[PDB]
């Protein structure tokens, strides 16, 4: 009887800054020992102030976003405004929980601005618990990125260091370095890097290649 999940790999990465949020993802899509496609981005723009990251089973990653954009346009009809970042997170927690006993095998990471112009990263489980963080790695290669970000963003296990705030130019190089480190050691991550930076002007993109093997 029909083993109903397949782990389709991928890592996503979000960092909440002082006045920005960066969301990054690979574009390699896998199935055990095969590479399906090399251009399949995992960052999905929801509104002007929120971009979401997807990792896990790809069919639920498509189905859930086709639900979320519908719920956003229902909200924009009934409430005459776009949703905030916290409203999207609180909505998606109920949406993920309502499939409790057949869960969407999706690790959601919502990045964006709140209404006060600060970065907010909301990282979820498949069953709908959620919390606000400053930075988060998810998906397949999370154990290779998360200790390095624990070193460089939270400044843990360092003595005689000035805890400087999160600037953009150092954070972007941090995202590129941790994905080079993930592509060197994890088989599932590679073939591109798609970076979404959410600032008050809008959302822009930068693409860097990774290892092809």
């Amino acid at each position: 009887r029909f083993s109903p999940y397949v782990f389709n790999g991928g890592t996503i990465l979000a960092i909440a800054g002082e006045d920005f949020a960066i969301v990054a993802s690979d574009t390699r899509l896998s199935e055990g020992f095969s590479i399906h496609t090399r251009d399949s981005p995992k960052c999905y723009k929801l509104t002007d102030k929120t971009v979401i990251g997807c990792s896990g089973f790809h069919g639920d990653c498509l189905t859930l976003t086709k639900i979320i954009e519908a719920r956003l346009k229902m909200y924009k009809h009934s409430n005459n405004k776009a949703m905030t970042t916290g409203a999207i997170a609180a909505m998606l927690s109920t949406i993920l929980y309502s499939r409790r006993f057949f869960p969407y095998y999706v690790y959601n990471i919502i990045g964006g601005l709140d209404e006060e112009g600060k970065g907010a990263v909301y990282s979820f489980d498949p069953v709908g618990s959620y919390q606000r963080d400053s930075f988060k790695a998810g998906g397949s290669a999370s154990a290779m990125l998360q200790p390095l970000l624990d070193n460089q963003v939270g400044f843990k296990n360092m003595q005689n260091v000035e805890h400087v705030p999160l600037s953009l130019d150092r954070a972007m190089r941090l995202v590129k370095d941790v994905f080079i480190s993930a592509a060197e050691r994890d088989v599932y991550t590679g073939d591109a890097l798609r970076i979404c930076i959410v600032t008050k002007e809008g959302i822009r993109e930068e693409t860097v290649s990774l290892r092809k093997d």
């Binding site: 929980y97 069953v127 618990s129 919390q131």
Partner: peptide, 27 residues
């Protein structure tokens, strides 16, 4: 994670707690 809020704030007078499953507690 190392920053889980394991006391869930019910209202201005009540508190709930987290053990076992997180989302099962929270919902």
């Amino acid at each position: 994670s190392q920053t889980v809020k394991k006391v869930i704030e019910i209202n201005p007078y009540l508190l709930g707690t987290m053990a076992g499953g997180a989302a099962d507690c929270s919902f």
